[PDB]
Structures are given as C-alpha cells and as structure tokens.
Amino acid sequence: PQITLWQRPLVTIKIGGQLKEALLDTGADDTVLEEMSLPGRWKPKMIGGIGGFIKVRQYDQILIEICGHKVIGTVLVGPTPTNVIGRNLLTQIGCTLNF
Amino acid sequence: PQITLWQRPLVTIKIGGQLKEALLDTGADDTVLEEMSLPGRWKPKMIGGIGGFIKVRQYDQILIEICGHKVIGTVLVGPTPTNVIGRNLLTQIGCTLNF
Ligand SMILES: CC(C)(C)OC(=O)N[C@@H](Cc1ccccc1)[C@H](O)CN[C@@H](Cc1ccccc1)C(=O)N[C@@H](CCC(=O)O)C(=O)N[C@@H](Cc1ccccc1)C(N)=O
Ligand SMILES: [Cl-]
Ligand SMILES: [Cl-]
Ligand SMILES: [Cl-]
Ligand code: NA
C-alpha cells in the first residue's frame, strides 16, 4: 500500500486469530497494545510517551499479521487508548516514509 | 526521500527564525514542540498520548520549512519530551507510508 495521512493510518491487524485495529506510528520505537490475552511470560518495562511514563508488560516473540505481512517481535501491553505499531515491527514489513 | 525506520526518523525544521530537530510522527494528529518562543496569538489546548494528558499553547498559521518545503499550520508548544511533526504538517509535504 501507499497510505496518505489526511486521516489516522489505522490498519487491520491479526493476533491469535483476533482481528483488531492498530495505528501505524513512525514516532513509536516500540509496539504498545491495549489489554488482551498474549500467550507467554512477561517482564516489566517502563516507557515514555508525550504525557509521561507508564508501566507495561513486555512479551517477546509474538506473531502478528499486518496487512497480510506476518511479523514476529516484542509487544508491550499497557494503558493506551489505541493499539500502536512501532518501528520494531514496521521495519519487518519494509515500511518507509516517502515524500 | 524514501526514509527507512531502522532509526528514529529525525529531520531539521526551520521555524520562528530557529533551527530544530524533530520526529516525523505518523501516530501524532498534531505538531508539538519543546518550550520555545513563537510569534503571534495563542490559545490553550489539552493533548494526550501514552502517559496521559498535557497542556500546550496552540499557535495557528505558523510557517515551517521542512526539507525545502514551506508549509503552514498549527504548532503546539508545551512540555513534550520531544519535538514531533504530526499529520497536520506531514500531509502538506506530501508524506506517505509505503510497504
Ligand atoms: C508509543 C511509544 C512507544 C510510547 O512512543 C511514543 O509515545 N512516542 C511519541 C514520541 C515520543 C518519543 C520519545 C519520548 C516521548 C515521546 C510518539 O508521538 C507516539 N505517537 C502517538 C502514540 C499514541 C497514539 C494514539 C493514542 C495514544 C498514543 C501519540 O502520542 N500521539 C498523540 C500526539 C500529540 C497530539 O497529536 O496532539 C496524538 O495523536 N494525540 C491526539 C489523539 C489522542 C487523544 C486523546 C488521548 C490520546 C491520543 C490528541 N488530540 O491529543
Ligand atoms: Cl521486536
Ligand atoms: Cl493545521
Ligand atoms: Cl495527497
Ligand atoms: Na538507519
């Protein structure tokens, strides 16, 4: 795809068979997700956003499908109103910013 | 350019007589800069992200040069940990996401 930015770059993703909605975010180093069931063990992490710091649950080696692109990586679960796909995963589908 | 995402997509911008480094951020609705002096009228605004909400000064019709484009838009100034270029200005330089 080529996605313009007149509206939020929301895309369907698929995790553990569930379809959900996530924002493609070039300003996010990491992928941060709303509360949901993830398979393995988690460790603690703190990360910073525009509003300040939050505590998250870090899960590794998680399979996500993004617009038909399979992707495996680290996913952070915490207080967010939006699922955010960050650079750690955008680099795996070959995403670039073009102008 | 075609900008890959292995590192933070930082760009030098020119605003209110000053040179700033900022983050091309497709997950941000608005442009938000670290504390600085800017010409003109401003009104207050509340914005959010990871970590919650912050209060920022909203300045309308600000001229910003980005990679040789002179664009116009609203710029917010506030206690952000980082200067961010959001979709309101990204659309104006024709920036798209591609994969
Ligand atoms: C997601 C992680 C990995 C934690 O990274 C960042 O948050 N990085 C931010 C930059 C940064 C780097 C280093 C240190 C500190 C900050 C990006 O801006 C992240 N982009 C989004 C992430 C996001 C999207 C959607 C929901 C929550 C969070 C963002 O904050 N976007 C804000 C930027 C500020 C702005 O545009 O005004 C936004 O669109 N805010 C809207 C939408 C909104 C409304 C209410 C609550 C939350 C979001 C708004 N009108 O305030
Ligand atoms: Cl990863
Ligand atoms: Cl604007
Ligand atoms: Cl366009
Ligand atoms: Na690089």
Curated annotation (Swiss-Prot), chains A, B:
Residues 1-5, 49-55, 88-99 are annotated as: Dimerization of protease. Residues 20-89 form the Peptidase A2 domain. The chain holds residues 501 to 599 of 1447 of the full protein. It comes from Human immunodeficiency virus type 1 group M subtype B (isolate BRU/LAI) (HIV-1). The active site is at 25 (for protease activity). Homodimer, whose active site consists of two apposed aspartic acid residues. The lineage of its organism: Viruses, Riboviria, Pararnavirae, Artverviricota, Revtraviricetes. Signal peptide: none annotated. Coiled coil: none annotated. It comes from the Viruses. This is Protease. Transmembrane segments: none annotated.
